[PDB]
Design a binder for this molecule. Structure first.
Ligand SMILES: *[C@@H]1O[C@H](CO)[C@@H](O)[C@H](O)[C@H]1NC(C)=O
Ligand SMILES: *[C@@H]1O[C@H](CO)[C@@H](O)[C@H](O)[C@H]1NC(C)=O
Ligand SMILES: *[C@@H]1O[C@H](CO)[C@@H](O)[C@H](O)[C@H]1NC(C)=O
Ligand SMILES: *[C@@H]1O[C@H](CO)[C@@H](O)[C@H](O)[C@H]1NC(C)=O
Ligand SMILES: *[C@@H]1O[C@H](CO)[C@@H](O)[C@H](O)[C@H]1NC(C)=O
Ligand SMILES: *[C@@H]1O[C@H](CO)[C@@H](O)[C@H](O)[C@H]1NC(C)=O
Ligand SMILES: *[C@@H]1O[C@H](CO)[C@@H](O)[C@H](O)[C@H]1NC(C)=O
Ligand SMILES: *[C@@H]1O[C@H](CO)[C@@H](O)[C@H](O)[C@H]1NC(C)=O
Ligand SMILES: *[C@@H]1O[C@H](CO)[C@@H](O)[C@H](O)[C@H]1NC(C)=O
Ligand SMILES: *[C@@H]1O[C@H](CO)[C@@H](O)[C@H](O)[C@H]1NC(C)=O
Ligand SMILES: *[C@@H]1O[C@H](CO)[C@@H](O)[C@H](O)[C@H]1NC(C)=O
Lengths: 413, 419, 211, 149
C-alpha cells in the first residue's frame, strides 16, 4: 500500500523494499599497537625550520589523538582537506608526515592546496588533492627578538616554481640579468634568501607564526598510525555495522575461501566496493556481503476480496529467510497444490498463484492446456458435417492524448 | 570492391517460354528473437548501497527512483507476453501417434526425444548448445520454463503433422500426411498427381534436407548469431551499469563509505550529491536504452507470432514470408530467447525451353488454355500446367473459346481435339 | 649488447585482492617487446635510471649480490645501497661515500634486514617513495632473456624522499643481467579465481592490442 | 475488462502527467521546492545557487517525461499501423492470412469506433461436427488412375 501510494491494492504481484535486518552491533577493528604518537616532538620543539628548508617528521607504529590537537589552546589556525577534523580519531593511515617551518602571520594563507606567492612557489608547495591538516600558531615569544631574530629565512628568488613537496636549500647568488654573479652581489646579482628579522614590536601579521602540515597516507596498505578508539569482539554469520581501519559499512561478516596473497589487505567487487578484508589483529580473510538479501514481492488477490497475502523472497533459499521453495525464490503464506490450472497470478519458472478454497492463497504449476491425441492413421480422414458462424472482437489502440507543456512555466512559474 | 552477384541475361523473346521439368524440396532455417533477460534494479540499493545518509538525500529527488523501477517492471512483464504470443497458439496439447506412418517423411529429428529430462527434439538440443548482483541488480526467471516452451513446439508440430492447417481454424481433423502434402501442392499451383507420382522422391528430398539442418547446426558455430547478439547486448549493458559505480563524477571518492568515514555531515552531503547525480544519470541511461531495446524485441516477437500463424498454422501465398521458393509447410523449434522456423518450400529445378503461343486457332475460333500454357516441342502443340512440365493433347475440355482468330497478337493455327 | 624484452616486466599494481576479472590500469611498465640492454658479469658500469627501471639476472652460482642508486654518490646527498645475496638482505639509505669500483670483498635515516634460475626485480621512485617488486623461477635458456609471463610481487616500499637519476649493480671480487626503462603505459591485466595475475595486454603495443 | 488495452493507454498518460506534477514538490537539494519562498528569503547571489538546483532537477524531470512519451508514441504508431492494415485487409477485403482477422476461416469484418482506438468485429466460418471416413489418394478404373478435381 505504501509502495503503491494507495489504500486499495488490485490483484497481482508487487515488488516492495529489499529484504534486510537491522545491524546487531557496531563492530570495531584496529591493529592493537600500544605507543602514543610523538606529536610533542613536532609541536613543542625549541628549534624550528626556516621555510626554504622545511623539516619533515615521519609518524608511524603508534596511536594518535587528533581531538587533543584540534581542541588544544595552542593553535591560532587549524584546517583540513580530504578529511574533516571531527572524524580523524575514527581513522587509520599507512603513515603520517609532519612538515614544519616558521613564516610571518600574514603569509599562513599561502599554506593551502593550489596556492601562489613566495612561500607557496619558492619554499613549500602542496598538491591540488592534498589530504591532511594545516596547523599554525603565533610564536612571537619563542621566535621574535629585540633588534631582530634573523635565524629564520625564506627563499626570495628561484629560476622556477617548486613541484609538490619539492625541497631546495641552495644559496647560489641569483642572476637577475646579464651580470655573471660568480659568488658576489651587484647590479642584477642578489642573495636568494631573505629574513623576516622578527621583533616583538611588530604588528600581528609581521609577528612569527609556526606552521605544521600533517599529511595523511590514507592508502589501502596496512596501517601504522591509528586513532584512540578501541576494538570490539568480532561477529560472524549475523548482520552488523562495522569499522575496520576507518572503513565503515553494514553486512553479514563471514569466513571466506578467498586466498589473498601475503601483501593484500582488502578485496574489491567489479563496482570497486569492498567485498572482503583481512582483519588487522589476526590474518583472517572475512567476506563483507551485505545483510543476506533479495527483492521482496508481495502476492495479493485484490483488497476488494481479501487481506490474505503471500510473500516471495526473490532468489533467497527458504533456510536464509506455509513455506515453499520455488525456483523464483522462497514463497511463504501460499498453500502448495498438486492440481494445475490456467495461470492466475504469475510467480515465475512455471509457478502461478490464485485465491481458492475456507479461502486461501494457493500456489501451483501452470497448465499449458488440455491434452489431446489426434486419431491419425494413413487412411482415415475427418470431415465436418456442419459449421458455426463466429463473431469475435479485436480491440486496438490507435491514438493517445495530445499533451503540450510550456517548459518555462513548468520550470520557472 | 564488393560484388553484387553474378551477371545474368534472361533468354527473353516474344514467343519463348522456360518450364521446369523437375523440382527440389528445400528446407531453410529462419531464426527470430522473441524475448530478452528480465531484470530488476532496486534504484536505492544501486545509488546508495544501504547508507541511510545517502537514502535521505535521494528522497529530495522525489519519484525518479520509483519511475525507473516501474519502467523495468513493464519491460520484464512484456518478455513473458512476447513469449506467450509466439508459443501459446495451440489451445490443446496435441501428441503424435505411436506409429509414425507419414508416407515416408521422417520427423524424428524435430519431434521430442523421450529420453531427455526436458523432452526437446534432437535439433532443439543442437540449438540450446549453440547460444551460451549485490549492487541492487537482479535477473528474474521467465514465466514459461524451457520444458514448457518445448511442450508448445511439440504440440504445434504434432497438430501440423497429423491434421494439416485444420487445428489452426477449429478442431484438429486427421488427414493422411501424403494427402496433406497433395493439398500443399495444389496450394502452390502444382497438380496433385505430381505428388503421388513422385512421393518416394519428395519424401527422400525432405528427409535429406532435414539431415543438412543437423550438419549445419552441428558445425557452423555462427548460425544463431541473432540470438547470441541479444544475450551479448544485455550482458554488456549490466556490466556497464555495474562499472559506473566505480566513477567519481567529481566527488573525492566513488566509495560512499570513504565519504561518510572521512567527512562530517555538511561536508559529506556535498560529495554524496555528486555520486547521487552521476549514479541516477547512469541508471536513467540504462533504463532508457533497455526501453528502446525492448521495443525491437517486441517487433521481432510480433513478427515471430505472425510467422507462427501464417507459416506453421497455414500455407502462405506471401512471397519470401516463409522462406525462398513456393511455401509448402513450416515447423517451429525452440531456441534460447527465440524461435527457429524450418520452412519447407518447392523450388522448380530443371528448365527446358519451348515455343509458346497465347491462343490457338481452330475452325476460325480462338482457344485459350483453362489452367495451363500452350507449348511446342518444335513440331507438335501441347497444353501444360504452368509450374511443372507435364504436356497434354490440346482438347475442347482443357481450353475455352473466345471470339475469332483475327484479334489476338501471336495466335497460331493448330487442331483442337474433341473427345 | 641488446635483447627484445617480450612480455617481461609486469607486477601487481596495488595491495587489493581481485578475482575472475579483467582489470585496466595505468602505471610505469616495461613496454612489451621493448629494447632491453644486456650485460655479462660472469661488467657493472653506472647506468641512468629515468622514471624507473626493470632489472633481471640469471642464476646458478651467486655472482651478482646488490645495487647502488643515487645521482652523485659522493656523500653531498643521500643514496640507496641494497644487498641481496641469498644468505642476507641488508638495505641502508645514508649520505654514502664510495670508490668508482665497489665490490663485496672476497645520515642513515632507515635500515631494512632479512643457467638454472632467473631473478626479476622492478625499481621505481614516485611521489617520494622508492618501491621494490620481484619474482624468481627456474629456466632452461642460458643464452638470453626468455619469452614468457609471470607477475612480480611487492617486496618493500621506502618513504625515503631521495631524488635518483643513476644506478649500478654489485659483484663479489678481490652471471648475465638485463636492464630496461619503464614508461607510463596502460595495461589490461587478468585475475584468475585465486587473484593471480596470469596474463596482460600492453594497450599501446600495436592496433590489435589497442583493440 | 474487454476494453483493458484502451483503458491502459488512458491510465499510462494520466500517471505520466501526475508524476510530472508531483516532481514540482521535490527540493532537488535546494532549501525549498517553492521558488517564491527562495526569492522572498534570499538575496540575488544566494538565491541563484538555490534556483539552479530547482532548474536542473525540473529540467531533468521534464526531459524524462518527453523521452517516455516518445517511446510510448512509437508503440501507439505500431498499433495504429496494424489497425490501418486490419482495416484494409479485413474490412475492405477478405483475408487468406491465418489468424489475422480472428480465429477460423475469415468471412468478413466490421469496424466500431472506441475511445483512443478501434474495435473489429471479425466474422469467421468454423467447421463444427466431424465424422470419420476411410480415404484414398486416387481410384483405379480401366487400369487408369483417377484423382479428384
Ligand atoms: C595484540 O594482538 C596480538 C595478536 O596479533 C596478541 O598476541 C597480543 O597479546 C595483543 N596484545 C594486546 C596488548 O592486546
Ligand atoms: C469487489 O469484490 C466483490 C467480491 O469480493 C465483487 O462482487 C465486486 O463486484 C467488486 N467490486 C467491483 C466494483 O466490481
Ligand atoms: C536450500 O538450502 C539448503 C541448505 O541450507 C539445501 O539443503 C537445499 O538444497 C537448498 N535448496 C535449493 C533449491 O537450493
Ligand atoms: C503432492 O505431490 C508430492 C510429490 O510430488 C507428494 O509428496 C505430496 O504428498 C502431494 N500432496 C498432495 C496434497 O497431493
Ligand atoms: C534457351 O535458349 C537460349 C537460346 O539462345 C539459351 O541461351 C538458353 O540458355 C536456353 N535456356 C534453357 C533453360 O535451356
Ligand atoms: C515476334 O517477333 C518476330 C521478330 O523476331 C515478329 O516477326 C513476330 O511478328 C512477333 N510475334 C509476336 C507474337 O509478337
Ligand atoms: C636497440 O637500439 C639500438 C640503437 O640504440 C639498436 O642498435 C638495436 O638494434 C636495438 N635493438 C632492438 C632489439 O631493436
Ligand atoms: C651476504 O651479505 C652479508 C653482509 O650483509 C655478508 O656477511 C655475507 O657473507 C654475504 N653472503 C654472500 C653469499 O655473499
Ligand atoms: C650528515 O649530514 C652532514 C651535513 O649536515 C654531512 O656532512 C655528513 O656527511 C652526513 N653524514 C654522512 C654519514 O654522510
Ligand atoms: C587456485 O589455487 C589452488 C591452490 O591454492 C589450486 O588447487 C587451484 O587449481 C587454483 N585454481 C586455478 C583456476 O588456477
Ligand atoms: C474417429 O475415430 C477414432 C478412432 O480411434 C475415434 O477416437 C474418434 O472419436 C472418432 N471421431 C469421430 C468424430 O467420430
Amino acid at each position: 500500500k505504501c509502495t503503491l501510494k494507495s489504500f486499495t491494492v488490485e490483484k497481482g504481484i508487487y515488488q516492495t523494499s529489499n529484504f534486510r535486518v537491522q545491524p546487531t552491533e557496531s563492530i570495531v577493528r584496529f591493529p592493537n599497537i600500544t605507543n602514543l604518537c610523538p606529536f610533542g616532538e613536532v609541536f613543542n620543539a625549541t628549534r624550528f625550520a626556516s621555510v626554504y628548508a622545511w623539516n619533515r617528521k615521519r609518524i608511524s607504529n603508534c596511536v594518535a589523538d587528533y581531538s587533543v590537537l584540534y581542541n588544544s589552546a595552542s593553535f591560532s589556525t587549524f584546517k583540513c582537506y580530504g578529511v574533516s577534523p571531527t572524524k580523524l580519531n575514527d581513522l587509520c593511515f599507512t603513515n603520517v608526515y609532519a612538515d614544519s617551518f616558521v613564516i610571518r602571520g600574514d603569509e599562513v594563507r599561502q599554506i593551502a592546496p593550489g596556492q601562489t606567492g613566495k612561500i607557496a612557489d619558492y619554499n613549500y608547495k602542496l598538491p591540488d588533492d592534498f589530504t591532511g591538516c594545516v596547523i599554525a600558531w603565533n610564536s612571537n615569544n619563542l621566535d621574535s627578538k629585540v633588534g631582530g631574530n634573523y635565524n629564520y629565512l625564506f627563499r626570495l628568488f628561484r629560476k622556477s616554481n617548486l613541484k609538490p613537496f619539492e625541497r631546495d636549500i641552495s644559496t647560489e647568488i641569483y642572476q637577475a640579468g646579464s651580470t655573471p654573479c660568480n659568488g658576489v652581489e651587484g647590479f642584477n646579482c642578489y642573495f636568494p634568501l631573505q629574513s623576516y628579522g622578527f621583533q616583538p614590536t611588530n604588528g600581528v601579521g609581521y609577528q612569527p607564526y609556526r606552521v605544521v602540515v600533517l599529511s595523511f597516507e590514507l592508502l589501502h596498505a596496512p596501517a601504522t598510525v591509528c586513532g584512540p578508539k578501541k576494538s570490539t569482539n568480532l561477529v560472524k554469520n549475523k548482520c552488523v555495522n562495522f569499522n575496520f581501519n576507518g572503513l565503515t559499512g553494514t553486512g553479514v561478516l563471514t569466513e571466506s575461501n578467498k586466498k589473498f596473497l601475503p601483501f593484500q589487505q582488502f578485496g574489491r567487487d567489479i563496482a570497486d566496493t569492498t567485498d572482503a578484508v583481512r582483519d588487522p589483529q589476526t590474518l583472517e580473510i572475512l567476506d563483507i556481503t551485505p545483510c543476506s538479501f533479495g527483492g521482496v514481492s508481495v502476492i495479493t488477490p485484490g483488497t476488494n476480496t481479501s487481506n490474505q497475502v503471500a510473500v516471495l523472497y526473490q532468489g533467497v533459499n527458504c533456510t536464509e529467510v506455509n513455506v515453499f521453495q520455488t525456483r523464483a525464490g522462497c514463497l511463504i503464506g501460499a498453500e502448495h497444490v498438486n492440481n494445475s490450472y490456467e495461470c492466475d497470478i504469475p510467480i515465475g519458472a512455471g509457478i502461478c498463484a490464485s485465491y481458492q478454497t475456507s479461502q486461501s492463497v494457493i500456489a501451483y504449476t501452470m497448465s499449458l492446456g488440455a491434452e489431446n491425441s489426434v486419431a491419425y492413421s494413413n487412411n482415415s480422414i475427418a470431415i465436418p458435417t456442419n459449421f458455426t458462424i463466429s463473431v469475435t472482437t479485436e480491440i486496438l489502440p490507435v491514438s493517445m492524448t495530445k499533451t503540450s507543456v510550456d517548459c518555462t512555466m513548468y520550470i520557472c512559474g | 570492391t564488393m560484388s553484387l552477384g553474378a551477371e545474368n541475361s534472361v533468354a527473353y523473346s516474344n514467343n519463348s517460354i522456360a518450364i521446369p521439368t523437375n523440382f527440389t524440396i528445400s528446407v531453410t532455417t529462419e531464426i527470430l528473437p522473441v524475448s530478452m533477460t528480465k531484470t530488476s534494479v532496486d534504484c536505492t540499493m544501486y545509488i546508495c548501497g544501504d547508507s541511510t545518509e545517502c537514502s535521505n538525500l535521494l528522497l529530495q529527488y522525489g519519484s525518479f527512483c520509483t519511475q525507473l523501477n516501474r519502467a523495468l517492471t513493464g519491460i520484464a512483464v512484456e518478455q513473458d507476453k512476447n513469449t506467450q504470443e509466439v508459443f501459446a497458439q495451440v489451445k490443446q496439447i496435441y501428441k503424435t501417434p505411436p506409429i509414425k506412418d507419414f508416407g515416408g517423411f521422417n520427423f524424428s529429428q524435430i519431434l521430442p526425444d523421450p529420453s531427455k529430462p526436458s523432452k526437446r527434439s534432437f535439433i532443439e538440443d543442437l540449438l540450446f548448445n549453440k547460444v551460451t548482483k549485490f549492487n541492487g541488480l537482479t535477473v528474474l526467471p521467465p514465466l514459461l520454463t524451457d520444458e514448457m516452451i518445448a511442450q508448445y513446439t511439440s504440440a504445434l508440430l504434432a497438430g501440423t503433422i497429423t491434421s494439416g492447417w485444420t487445428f489452426g481454424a477449429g478442431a484438429a481433423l486427421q488427414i493422411p500426411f501424403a494427402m496433406q502434402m497433395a493439398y500443399r501442392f495444389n496450394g502452390i499451383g502444382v497438380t496433385q498427381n505430381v505428388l503421388y507420382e513422385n512421393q518416394k522422391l519428395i519424401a527422400n528430398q525432405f528427409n535429406s534436407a532435414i539431415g543438412k539442418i543437423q550438419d549445419s547446426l552441428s558445425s557452423t558455430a555462427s548460425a544463431l548469431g541473432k540470438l547470441q547478439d541479444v544475450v551479448n547486448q544485455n550482458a554488456q549493458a549490466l556490466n556497464t551499469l555495474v562499472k559506473q559505480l566505480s566513477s567519481n563524477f567529481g566527488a573525492i571518492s566513488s566509495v560512499l563509505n570513504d565519504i561518510l568515514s572521512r567527512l562530517d555531515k555538511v561536508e559529506a552531503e556535498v560529495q554524496i550529491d555528486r555520486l547521487i547525480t552521476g549514479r541516477l544519470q547512469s541508471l536513467q541511461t540504462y533504463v532508457t536504452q533497455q526501453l528502446i531495446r525492448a521495443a525491437e524485441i517486441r517487433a521481432s516477437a510480433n513478427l515471430a507470432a505472425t510467422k507462427m500463424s501464417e507459416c506453421v498454422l497455414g500455407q502462405s501465398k506471401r512471397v519470401d514470408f516463409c522462406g525462398k521458393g513456393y511455401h509448402l509447410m513450416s515447423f517451429p523449434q525452440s531456441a534460447p530467447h527465440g524461435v527457429v522456423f524450418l520452412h519447407v518450400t518447392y523450388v522448380p529445378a530443371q528448365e527446358k525451353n519451348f515455343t509458346t503461343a497465347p491462343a490457338i486457332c481452330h475452325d476460325g475460333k480462338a482457344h485459350f488454355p483453362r489452367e495451363g500454357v500452350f507449348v511446342s516441342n518444335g513440331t507438335h502443340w501441347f497444353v501444360t500446367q504452368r509450374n511443372f512440365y507435364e504436356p497434354q493433347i490440346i482438347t475442347t475440355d482443357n481450353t475455352f473459346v473466345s471470339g475469332n482468330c483475327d484479334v489476338v497478337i501471336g495466335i497460331v493455327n493448330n487442331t483442337v481435339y474433341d473427345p | 649488447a641488446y635483447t627484445n624484452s617480450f612480455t617481461r616486466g609486469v607486477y601487481y599494481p596495488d595491495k587489493v585482492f581481485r578475482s575472475s576479472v579483467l582489470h585496466s590500469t595505468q602505471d610505469l611498465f616495461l613496454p612489451f617487446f621493448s629494447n632491453v640492454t644486456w650485460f655479462h658479469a660472469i661488467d657493472n658500469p653506472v647506468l641512468p635510471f629515468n622514471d624507473g627501471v626493470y632489472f633481471a639476472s640469471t642464476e646458478k652460482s651467486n655472482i651478482i649480490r646488490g645495487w647502488i642508486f643515487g645521482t652523485t654518490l659522493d656523500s653531498k646527498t643521500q643514496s640507496l645501497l641494497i644487498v641481496n645475496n641469498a644468505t642476507n638482505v641488508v638495505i641502508k639509505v645514508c649520505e654514502f661515500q664510495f670508490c668508482n669500483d665497489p665490490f663485496l670483498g672476497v645520515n642513515c635515516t632507515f635500515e631494512y634486514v632479512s643457467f638454472k634460475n632467473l631473478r626479476e626485480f622492478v625499481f621505481k621512485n614516485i611521489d617520494g617513495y622508492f618501491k621494490i617488486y620481484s619474482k624468481h623461477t627456474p629456466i632452461n635458456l642460458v643464452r638470453d632473456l626468455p619469452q614468457g609471463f609471470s607477475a612480480l610481487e611487492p617486496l618493500v616500499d621506502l618513504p625515503i624522499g631521495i631524488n635518483i637519476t643513476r644506478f649500478q649493480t654489485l659483484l663479489a671480487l678481490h652471471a648475465a643481467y638485463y636492464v630496461g626503462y619503464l614508461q607510463p603505459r596502460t595495461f589490461l591485466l587478468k585475475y584468475n579465481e585465486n587473484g593471480t595475475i596470469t596474463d596482460a595486454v600492453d594497450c599501446a603495443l600495436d592496433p590489435l592490442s589497442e583493440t
